[PDB]
Design a protein around this ligand. Structure first.
Ligand SMILES: [Zn+2]
Ligand SMILES: [Zn+2]
Ligand SMILES: [Zn+2]
Lengths: 67, 97
């Protein structure tokens, strides 16, 4: 229970440090959507955090904030 | 100086990769456990994970100091990485000897 995606049983112990630190597996970090705490979310490339889908435009990998 | 848009290409020569473990700027972004030179798709701890394709003998890594980009192993050779800065002000290219 290290990946934030509900029911993801990937062993992050053996993942790259990036994934272990941000509590997300490679596939879930790149998924257009995933259920996190019962809510459809996407792993924001620029923030390295899950946000709810309304914070993104369509299929964009990063949320609307221009950093 | 070499530029692609508003992005400066900065070649950095190191006697070994261990020097970057003590570099105030770069130390958070390298993954020193990884074999073969990596680039970062974003700005976060340990973010330099994406295998650079067919790297030259002495390439140690690439760090883009801003923006996000396509994040995949064995896709982009070094010359192609210069084209996907996407808002990076500096592309640091780390070399040995
Ligand atoms: Zn996962
Ligand atoms: Zn975001
Ligand atoms: Zn982080």
């Amino acid at each position: 229970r290290l990946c934030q995606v509900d029911r993801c049983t990937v062993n992050l112990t053996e993942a790259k440090q990036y994934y272990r630190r941000h509590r997300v597996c490679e596939v879930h970090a790149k998924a257009s959507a995933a259920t996190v705490a019962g809510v459809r979310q996407r792993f924001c490339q620029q923030c390295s955090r899950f946000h709810e889908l309304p914070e993104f435009d369509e299929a964009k990998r990063s949320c609307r904030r221009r950093l | 100086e070499e530029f692609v848009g508003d992005m400066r290409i900065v070649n950095v020569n190191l006697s070994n990769i261990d020097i970057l473990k003590k570099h105030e700027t770069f130390k958070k972004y390298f993954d020193f456990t990884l074999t073969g030179p990596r680039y970062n798709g974003n700005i976060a701890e340990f973010a330099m994970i994406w295998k650079i394709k067919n790297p030259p003998l002495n390439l140690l890594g690439v760090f883009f100091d801003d923006g996000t980009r396509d994040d995949e192993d064995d896709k982009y050779i070094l010359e192609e990485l210069k084209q996907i800065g996407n808002g990076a002000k500096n592309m640091y290219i780390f070399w040995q000897y």
